[PDB]
């Protein structure tokens, strides 16, 4: 699901020249809105504690 | 005189005439990006080199390819101000042309099917705005200049310290754009060898096999040939006059010392030689008898006395050897080639495919594509053009100006110079010289970034080609912009050289954007960095500055661009001069680099010139190769072109500079960036004239676009109707200038711009309208003019500490503008949605008094620390509250909510006014009240300049149409451009309600954000840190009483008493200059003020000015006389606060025109006083220097470095205090603390500051309660470190254990 919000949201950003936002990323994949924030707001990979 | 100069013109007491004015100080910049950005048909520079070094995109199979056409940049969504407020980048859009083509197997290569064409987008590269700024992520950000090494071949040496024998080691080392390294070296055994990517060494000649050179081949270029043949049964040498100059010489008469020229003015071509000589010689071809079929010797083989009577058996008579001496040639080439083990091309190439991949199996195929990609291959390898000319200049090479790779020649030619060293002939190059060091800017920078993303791309569209499945698929498709956004994004947010602008003052400004840096990537490191760079270097005339580089680690690694310094199209400094012709001196200049100054001599601006242009004495000062000197006067070449060449904007402010000395001269250009802007600014009264140039070019005045008279002045905007003259057709005819007005700088700090114009007057262009932060009238404003006494008062200032009158902290002369940013989020939880609202629990009516109904404080509200900003409340779980506290709430009620109280609180000891506040909502949440009122707000305040614009252009046309009144023609056309008008101002501001109704894009999790500016009026107190601009910095260590400070005759009293002790030992003797200078100048103000109050006719008023400007033998020629009335009656307003004098550096006032203008003032001529003990009246018997002197409020205040803590947060690893007072952390107790307690022998206190006071987590928590039972005793335990450490160790597979 992550790996196809990325592919998408590429694919809107060359079509139209922006960022996708999520509500316009919600229609071409035919997946709720809310679940579209729920997988963004998912949490990346930590950041370590010993960055500068 | 400009109209903006005439209002207050400075007397300058300088002597030489100026030719050249200083140029834009941004240039730097502005040029750089200029380049990276703008269209470039050859494409040398800028997105097209970068392009074209990628592009065209070749497949493995070459079945197709993506070509590049052109690029283009869109309008930009947002502009630099509301880029700031939202916090995004001010950026525009990459649009490149691009076709995809297709090519049959079947068909041969080169037929074109079809084509596909189209423009697609790869990302956001971020604008610089006009003053050389970037804004990344909302905040204003520098891109700082590296000085680096300069591509090319540099030869270099050991000195001998890497073995005890007096021999040196030398070695050459080529350094690409884009490559691998290649050194080649000498041990100290005289052989020549290799290294590749800092590797281990190899012998030499292995790089000339893989180049296919025979060892004859190797010889011959490497050494050179003497010859022998067999004539009459006899040895015969050759004819080089050159080399003999001993056992005998077979020229019969000319025989010599069985000097040579006496008998070489007579030549033979005939010398004849034992066989003894030859034993000892090496050959230098390959000799093959076809009737034995083998090599009876080889070559670069001794020959021995067999060979000769072996080779004349074998018919030949012809024999060619090496020629050696020990001083002029040397066997190094011929005894590297007998220490290498290979013997043909592909035997050497598996060495070095073992050498670098050890361990991989040699393989043949793999070895040749190794070395065609280390060196010759144009993907991995390449020589910029500054580095192809520095090498075509080190070799002598003449051609190949476009090759960027390394061939045989230059490898060649790279040997032969190095070997020439080694053999005396020719010196190494200086690694520090500026001709060898390299300007890289933001234009390189970003082109450099920009291919590496490029190449990130290029790598997944070739692997898509190679698919082959090409049958719909338009070229927005292979094209991931991500990367390459991210690549600039990486670059403009993360680099080491793009740091957040220093924004205290304009010279802040001016010195980031001047900035040079030898660190960053490819740069140094601070702690391996060495003495020679950190030193200055006698090409740094000019070039880079001497005085200011940072004090500490980074001394000398970070330096500042000279006043004249340029850039020129390689990236070299390059400083101008004055050329001499005939012996008269020209206005014209050139610039010259480091290489073309070592040629010519140099004069400077302090030799005297004639009255016909010319020098006079006839030994004048000049420079040769670095070294000063005397030289004749027909021997000059160049001349300096003004005295502040050598000294950067910074240190050009600093007047009577050469009475100072280095390290004083230095604290002070460091100190002066920075002071601090005050609620008023006035101008120096001593100054150096630089100030309106650093002023103009900084940005932060309202400089006129074109001339004509402002047609109305207010606080936050300036109109002015263009001159009939600047006026393009169709034009409106007006300039708009919006005021910034008390926004937050970098450093927290007040940027407001204030108009010094009024209703009516005339501009021309270049003229100022707004003056900026520490800006008065155009001029560089930092600091105030003191009062100063030189003399000791009590202690109070002993060592450099400061005493202060109280005037000056009730007149306000140095309270300052703080704006403070405090950001409230509210995010989504697990538990809930975070609210921001009014009912806060456990909170009365007192607390959300300056609250509004929605949570937020109002504008104008007066706030203290624990006061609440902005009200919210965070869903909170369950709490299994304690027995008792179960009673509490069973015998009181008062039921728990669900809800707990985190709320956005004032920090302690901060009291403000709240100025603004700003709601950024996600797009879908409700819009609270306060949002609403705020967008209508913004919708008003920004329809008024499109309102403005659509009235007056609607009035004309009006106009027109009574003017007008075929007829009806006339009138369709007039309202169909009535028609057109309304139309564009209806899109104008639809664009602009879009704009403000636009939601924000939040990071993910978050729902709302609230930001309050709160400003803080903060005054001079002691612990505030005050300076000079001579490096007298200190602290003040008392407020004193008016009554209590040393007076004059007058009774006027001083404003600060300074130690005199700190003048002698410390070398600046340019402040007591300066006092002394102000003591004058203040006079003078004082009787201009005089005369203006007694109204005395304007004859006289004239006549003063007149001999106040005429005082000295100076370059300024101002005519009173050719002023207005109205304009003299400004001038003399203007300065009755004083007579501002310009002393440029290095041609200052000499100590006789001080005198002069102190007697014109009706002042002693020593500039000493008698002043008066306010504390007993009694008069000093000795008299005190009092004057004026320019102060300074630093950015280091006591009230942001108090900090005090008793018990807070803890670490989460360590469980120890916190570290800083933003994070209300605790003081670091380090080693050489423990050490001074185990000293003193408390090993008490020792014991609570290692266990209570840190770490021992029941230890503070019952010392705490002791102490509130009022015990003072202890119980200490184990450390929670040494428990961290223990487990550590057991990780580790280490039994580590406490016995008992």
Partial sequence: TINKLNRISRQMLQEMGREPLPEELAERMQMPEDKIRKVLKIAKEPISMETP | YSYTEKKRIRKDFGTRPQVLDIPYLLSIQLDSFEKFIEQDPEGQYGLEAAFRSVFPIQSYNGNSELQYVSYRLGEPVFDVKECQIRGVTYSKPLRVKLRLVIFDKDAPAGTVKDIKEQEVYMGEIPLMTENGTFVINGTERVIVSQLHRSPGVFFDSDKGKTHSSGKVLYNARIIPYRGSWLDFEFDPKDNLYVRIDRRRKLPASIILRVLGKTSAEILDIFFEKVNFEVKDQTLMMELVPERLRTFDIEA???????????????????????????????????????????????????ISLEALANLSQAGYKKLEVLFTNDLDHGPFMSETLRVDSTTDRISALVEIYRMMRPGEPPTKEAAESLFESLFFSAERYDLSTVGRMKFNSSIGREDAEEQGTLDEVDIIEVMKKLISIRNGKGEVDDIDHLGNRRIRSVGEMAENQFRVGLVRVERAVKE????????????????????????????????????????????????????????????????????????????????????????????????????????????????????????????????????????????????????????????????????????????????????????SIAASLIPFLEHDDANRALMGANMQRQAVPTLRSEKPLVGTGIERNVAVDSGVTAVAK????????????????????????????????????????????????????????????????????????????????????????????????????????????????????????????????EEITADIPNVGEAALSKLDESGIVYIGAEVKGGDILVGKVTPKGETQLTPEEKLLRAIFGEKASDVKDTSLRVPNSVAGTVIDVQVFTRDGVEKDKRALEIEQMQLKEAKKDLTEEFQILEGGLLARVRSVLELQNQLEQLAEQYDELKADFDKKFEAKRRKITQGDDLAPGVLKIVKVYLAVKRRIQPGDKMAGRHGNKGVISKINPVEDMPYDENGQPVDIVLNPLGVPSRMNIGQILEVHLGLAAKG????????????????????????????????????????????????????????????PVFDGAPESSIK????????????????????????????????????????????????????????????????????FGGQRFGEMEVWALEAYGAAYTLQEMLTVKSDDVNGRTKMYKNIVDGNHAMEPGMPESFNVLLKEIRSLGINIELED
């Fill in chain 2, 252 to 302: 019969d008469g000319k025989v010599y010392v069985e000097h040579i020229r006496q008998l070489e003015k007579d030549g033979v071509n005939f010398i004849e030689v034992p066989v003894e000589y030859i034993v000892g010689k090496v050959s230098a071809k390959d000799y093959v008898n076809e009737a034995t079929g083998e090599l009876i010797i080889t070559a670069n083989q001794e």
């Fill in chain 2, 464 to 647: 898509r080609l190679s698919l082959g499945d090409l049958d719909n698929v338009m070229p927005q498709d292979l094209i991931n912009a991500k990367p390459i956004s991210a690549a600039v994004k990486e670059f403009f947010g993360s680099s080491q050289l793009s740091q957040f602008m220093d924004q205290n003052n304009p010279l802040s400004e001016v010195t980031h954007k001047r900035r040079i840096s030898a660190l960053g990537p490819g740069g140094l490191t601070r702690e391996r960095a060495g003495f020679e760079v950190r030193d200055v270097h006698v090409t740094h005339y000019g070039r880079l500055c001497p005085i200011e580089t940072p004090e500490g680690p980074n001394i000398g690694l970070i330096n500042s661009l000279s006043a004249f310094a340029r850039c020129n199209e390689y990236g070299f400094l390059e400083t101008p001069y004055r050329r001499v012709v005939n012996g008269v001196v020209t206005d014209e200049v050139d610039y010259l680099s480091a290489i073309e100054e070592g040629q010519f001599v140099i004069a400077q601006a302090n030799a005297k010139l004639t009255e016909e242009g010319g020098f006079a004495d006839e030994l004048v000062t000049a420079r040769q190769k670095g070294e000063s000197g005397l030289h004749p006067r027909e021997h000059v070449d160049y001349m300096d072109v003004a005295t502040n060449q050598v000294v």
């Fill in chain 2, 706 to 833: 074109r001339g004509g008279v402002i047609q109305s002045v207010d606080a936050s905007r300036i109109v002015v109707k263009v001159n009939e003259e600047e006026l393009i057709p169709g034009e409106a005819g007006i300039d708009i200038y919006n005021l910034t007005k008390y926004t937050r700088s970098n450093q927290n700090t007040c940027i407001n711009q204030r108009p010094c114009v009024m209703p009516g007057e005339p501009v021309a262009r270049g003229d100022v309208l707004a003056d900026g932060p520490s800006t008065d009238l155009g001029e560089l404003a930092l600091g105030q003019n003191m009062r100063i006494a030189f003399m000791p008062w009590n202690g109070y200032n002993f060592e450099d500490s400061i005493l202060v009158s109280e005037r000056v902290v009730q007149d306000d002369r140095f309270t300052t503008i703080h704006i403070q940013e405090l950001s409230c989020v509210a995010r989504d939880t697990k538990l809930g949605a």
């Fill in chain 2, 1084 to 1143: 003078i103000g004082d009787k201009i003020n005089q005369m203006i109050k007694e109204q005395q006719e304007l004859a006289k008023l004239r006549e003063f000015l007149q001999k106040v400007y005429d005082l000295g033998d100076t370059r300024q020629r101002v005519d009173i006389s050719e002023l207005s009335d109205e304009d003299v009656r400004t001038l003399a307003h203007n300065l009755r606060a004083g007579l501002p004098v310009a002393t």
């Fill in chain 2, 1156 to 1223: 002069a203008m102190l007697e014109l003032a009706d002042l002693p001529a020593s500039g000493q006083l008698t002043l008066f003990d306010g504390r007993t009246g009694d008069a000093f018997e000795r008299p005190v220097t009092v004057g004026y002197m320019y102060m300074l409020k630093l950015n280091h205040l006591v009230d942001d470095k108090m900090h005090a803590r008793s018990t807070g947060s803890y670490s989460l690893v360590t469980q120890q205090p916190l570290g800083g007072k933003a994070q």
